[PDB]
Amino acid sequence: GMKETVSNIVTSQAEKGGVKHVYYVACGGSYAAFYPAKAFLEKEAKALTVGLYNSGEFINNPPVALGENAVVVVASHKGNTPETIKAAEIARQHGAPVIGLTWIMDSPLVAHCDYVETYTFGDGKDIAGEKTMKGLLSAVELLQQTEGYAHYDDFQDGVSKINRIVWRACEQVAERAQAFAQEYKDDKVIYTVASGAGYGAAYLQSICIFMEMQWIHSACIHSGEFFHTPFFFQFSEGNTRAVDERALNFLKKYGRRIEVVDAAALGLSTIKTTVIDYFNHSLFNNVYPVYNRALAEAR
Amino acid sequence: MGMKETVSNIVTSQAEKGGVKHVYYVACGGSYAAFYPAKAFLEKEAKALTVGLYNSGEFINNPPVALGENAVVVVASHKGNTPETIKAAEIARQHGAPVIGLTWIMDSPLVAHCDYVETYTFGDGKDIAGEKTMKGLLSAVELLQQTEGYAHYDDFQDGVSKINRIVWRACEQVAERAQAFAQEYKDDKVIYTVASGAGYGAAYLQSICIFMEMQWIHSACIHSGEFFHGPFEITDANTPFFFQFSEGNTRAVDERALNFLKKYGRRIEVVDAAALGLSTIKTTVIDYFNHSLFNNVYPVYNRALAEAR
């Protein structure tokens, strides 16, 4: 478990000055999957630092605080990406404990980590166990076991709820997804829009899905960026909902074509407002496939 | 010298309160990516100091819990009237965090909500040594030097003394190529920028600003790290790339990406810091000068591209 893994780390490093620095390092889909974890530590930590790196950049330009007071968390689906493996090696060379997240438990990556955690994956998976959620649980536990986390139980409550929310949401959007697919099957460019701890899910939707999967041009616009062609709009619940609302109003005043995917309409608010931020990504990242499958099958 | 003094006042003021432990850079728009080098600087170089970089909207709606008496907030607003950025300054001040404001305008409403104000050079013929990005960086270098010490302080200052001349010469130097670029690309509906490292924000600005809102050409900014491995899925055949070839610790990342794109025969406009005279700056600090180079060279390319229509 993450709890136990972190316990072992906090123990192993206590005599070395403790855990002061957290680095999430991955490529591609796995990089975006750690954005909620970075957002969590940035919002919630008073002592711990957090950094999120592309694996290439990390191995070519490691931080000076990489050492015995750093924990490095690496992710690679197949446990094969050479740059992420090299990140783990470089971490261990500096005396930093390495947690690997992988689906393939005897991949090359496992050989260069101190701890390995796996996640649920594919159709039918339980969301409470998915990669993003393991990344978040690493952050939650690293916080809780170093400085304390005031909303630990609220977070675990959220973990116990998110699977049911997502399965229901996927059912709920299934009709709209059909219409969306009709209305957008000829578009060569679709923007995504998001903010806050869920931003990474919209970034994945642009890059991994529209561009790399469907040869549709895309960019992901932060909601705050409009002040200073259709839009696939991520309307979050929690502390940046007001940022998103302002952006949506703006877009509608230009009569843009906008597909709105609203966390509040999809039942996310059974999660307590103390932690709801951190569950936007898991909602959107597991709801978008309904829209994407429909889009692809209209083309 | 002014930024050294400001930070000196803050270090003194926060000393009997536990010291400065957290630095936040907050802005909208063009000011925001302008602080990416400062973020990259503290992330690479600091052992104790945390750094965060925020859009003002997100800062005011979701402020970090560490915002308090051991935090410093640097806000930037050009005319000093971004309501969100004024509100960011006010929220910090309410939390007991010293605020440094960056503006071109000493009279602006922003000045009334900052503990300290620094101005910066602006417009054509400006001293790059004094530009917004550079003041952001100097806040970071002084905050680090005056708290933990900074091993490359003098090298950093050397860089500051050279950057203005490097940038003006590079602007003259690319004038011819910029013409050719303009002709080559005048008919294009999509240009991607590519970059890595502490200069990435300049490539982000180049996409989202210049391209996507000066020629209304679809653009996006892609990190060099995306082009390490096949398959080549991201774009179709004819989509071209405006490629920021950095000097410093991520040059190798960029070199890999560049070779990947050439291997697949892509249309690439290369702007190379190494070929524009940045390499007089010591390698200990050269990462931090990429932004100021590219952000001040791109105008030449962009003016010619807009004219070629």
Side-chain angles (χ1 to χ4, degrees), chain A residues 1-187 189-227 229-255 257-299, chain B residues 2-78 80-188 190-225 227-309:
Chain A
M2 260 311 159
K3 187 188 180 73
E4 165 166 5
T5 298
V6 169
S7 204
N8 294 162
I9 292 171
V10 167
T11 300
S12 72
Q13 303 311 109
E15 189 169 350
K16 288 91 176 310
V19 176
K20 291 172 148 165
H21 307 103
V22 195
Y23 298 108
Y24 291 97
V25 185
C27 296
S30 279
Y31 167 94
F34 283 146
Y35 192 91
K38 179 227 183 191
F40 177 88
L41 286 179
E42 279 190 342
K43 172 68 192 208
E44 303 287 351
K46 304 179 192 210
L48 214 50
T49 68
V50 64
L52 170 60
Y53 287 72
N54 172 77
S55 296
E57 173 144 341
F58 182 85
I59 68 183
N60 281 274
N61 195 35
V64 308
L66 187 58
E68 64 190 358
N69 308 115
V71 174
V72 176
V73 190
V74 295
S76 177
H77 185 74
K78 285 190 161 169
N80 54 346
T81 303
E83 297 66 43
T84 298
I85 290 170
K86 184 66 159 161
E89 292 160 5
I90 280 177
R92 302 224 293 174
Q93 289 168 194
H94 288 57
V98 174
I99 310 172
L101 271 40
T102 192
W103 170 251
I104 295 171
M105 283 297 286
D106 61 357
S107 49
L109 179 62
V110 170
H112 304 93
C113 308
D114 302 298
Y115 308 88
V116 173
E117 277 274 302
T118 189
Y119 47 79
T120 67
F121 180 65
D123 287 340
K125 71 184 170 179
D126 173 6
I127 308 312
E130 68 169 6
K131 181 168 61 179
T132 289
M133 196 64 35
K134 297 313 181 73
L136 229 16
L137 288 162
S138 71
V140 162
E141 286 298 342
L142 289 157
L143 190 62
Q144 170 61 23
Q145 293 191 47
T146 57
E147 47 186 279
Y149 173 36
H151 308 291
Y152 184 91
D153 297 334
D154 289 355
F155 196 96
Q156 297 296 345
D157 179 63
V159 172
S160 72
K161 286 171 173 177
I162 188 61
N163 189 69
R164 164 168 194 274
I165 295 164
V166 162
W167 283 81
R168 287 163 62 76
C170 284
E171 183 183 344
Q172 173 180 355
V173 298
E175 250 191 66
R176 181 61 205 143
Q178 283 312 323
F180 156 84
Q182 284 315 303
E183 303 176 14
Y184 291 100
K185 57 197 199 194
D186 305 309
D187 285 279
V189 182
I190 310 181
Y191 292 114
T192 64
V193 188
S195 66
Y199 176 78
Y203 179 85
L204 285 173
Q205 179 62 16
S206 303
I207 311 304
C208 294
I209 306 303
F210 294 141
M211 279 195 281
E212 286 176 358
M213 253 188 42
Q214 304 198 239
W215 259 11
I216 291 165
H217 295 269
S218 199
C220 182
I221 311 169
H222 183 98
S223 293
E225 198 183 310
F226 289 104
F227 317 94
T229 309
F231 293 90
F232 192 78
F233 193 100
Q234 191 175 295
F235 198 5
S236 75
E237 270 265 57
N239 291 305
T240 75
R241 182 172 183 83
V243 176
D244 287 345
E245 182 155 357
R246 172 164 186 231
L248 181 50
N249 289 343
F250 172 83
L251 248 38
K252 279 182 179 163
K253 277 170 174 302
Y254 282 89
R257 294 151 71 222
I258 314 160
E259 189 71 23
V260 174
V261 189
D262 185 348
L266 292 181
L268 189 65
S269 58
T270 67
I271 296 180
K272 278 143 190 188
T273 58
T274 48
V275 298
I276 194 167
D277 287 15
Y278 306 118
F279 292 88
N280 287 277
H281 182 123
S282 293
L283 179 72
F284 290 115
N285 181 249
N286 292 102
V287 159
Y288 287 153
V290 179
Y291 295 83
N292 302 336
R293 272 191 293 290
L295 220 207
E297 187 151 47
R299 292 156 57 114
Chain B
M3 191 57 73
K4 178 178 191 183
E5 199 197 351
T6 289
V7 163
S8 204
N9 291 151
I10 288 158
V11 170
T12 299
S13 80
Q14 305 313 103
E16 295 177 67
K17 294 196 278 271
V20 353
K21 294 193 184 79
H22 306 108
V23 187
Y24 300 101
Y25 293 92
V26 187
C28 310
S31 293
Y32 157 88
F35 284 152
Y36 191 91
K39 171 222 214 287
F41 178 91
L42 290 177
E43 284 193 336
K44 167 66 169 191
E45 305 288 356
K47 285 173 291 315
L49 231 44
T50 73
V51 64
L53 166 65
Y54 287 77
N55 163 85
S56 300
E58 178 147 340
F59 184 78
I60 67 181
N61 280 279
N62 198 25
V65 306
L67 185 62
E69 289 178 7
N70 310 103
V72 171
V73 178
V74 189
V75 301
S77 184
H78 177 81
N81 60 356
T82 321
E84 300 89 297
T85 304
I86 295 172
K87 182 70 158 170
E90 212 47 62
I91 284 157
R93 289 204 78 237
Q94 293 164 204
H95 282 80
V99 172
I100 303 167
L102 263 60
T103 177
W104 194 57
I105 290 305
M106 286 318 285
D107 48 66
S108 59
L110 180 67
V111 168
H113 307 267
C114 303
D115 300 299
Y116 308 84
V117 174
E118 292 291 316
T119 201
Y120 54 77
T121 61
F122 168 69
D124 315 310
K126 70 195 186 168
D127 181 10
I128 305 312
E131 76 173 356
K132 180 161 57 193
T133 288
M134 282 302 325
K135 294 306 178 75
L137 226 17
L138 286 165
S139 74
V141 331
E142 287 296 340
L143 280 157
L144 179 65
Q145 173 44 44
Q146 294 190 44
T147 55
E148 318 191 358
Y150 176 32
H152 307 295
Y153 188 89
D154 293 335
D155 292 351
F156 198 97
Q157 295 308 321
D158 173 61
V160 170
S161 67
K162 289 173 180 163
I163 186 64
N164 181 60
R165 185 165 199 288
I166 289 158
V167 154
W168 285 45
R169 295 180 113 63
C171 286
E172 295 157 7
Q173 171 179 348
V174 299
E176 170 172 64
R177 181 65 209 138
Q179 315 277 225
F181 160 80
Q183 293 313 306
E184 174 56 7
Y185 290 98
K186 63 174 171 194
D187 310 298
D188 279 275
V190 181
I191 318 177
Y192 285 129
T193 66
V194 181
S196 64
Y200 181 81
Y204 178 102
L205 285 171
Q206 172 67 354
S207 267
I208 301 311
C209 296
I210 280 41
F211 286 156
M212 192 142 58
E213 308 171 1
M214 191 186 179
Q215 286 103 192
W216 289 94
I217 309 163
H218 174 253
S219 186
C221 182
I222 308 151
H223 188 273
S224 301
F227 300 101
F228 270 37
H229 300 294
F232 202 136
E233 297 166 354
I234 195 169
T235 59
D236 64 290
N238 206 45
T239 309
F241 294 87
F242 191 81
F243 191 95
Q244 189 179 115
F245 202 176
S246 67
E247 275 281 63
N249 298 301
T250 69
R251 188 170 183 79
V253 176
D254 295 341
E255 180 174 286
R256 183 146 180 188
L258 186 54
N259 288 330
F260 184 92
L261 296 165
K262 289 178 170 156
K263 165 88 173 48
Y264 283 94
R266 310 304 298 252
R267 296 167 62 207
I268 319 166
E269 191 66 38
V270 185
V271 193
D272 187 351
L276 292 173
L278 192 65
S279 316
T280 58
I281 292 170
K282 289 281 164 60
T283 76
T284 53
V285 301
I286 191 166
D287 289 19
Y288 306 116
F289 289 94
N290 286 287
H291 182 121
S292 286
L293 177 72
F294 290 112
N295 180 252
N296 288 291
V297 156
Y298 284 164
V300 182
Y301 286 80
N302 297 333
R303 190 190 315 118
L305 189 286
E307 285 165 13
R309 273 130 64 121

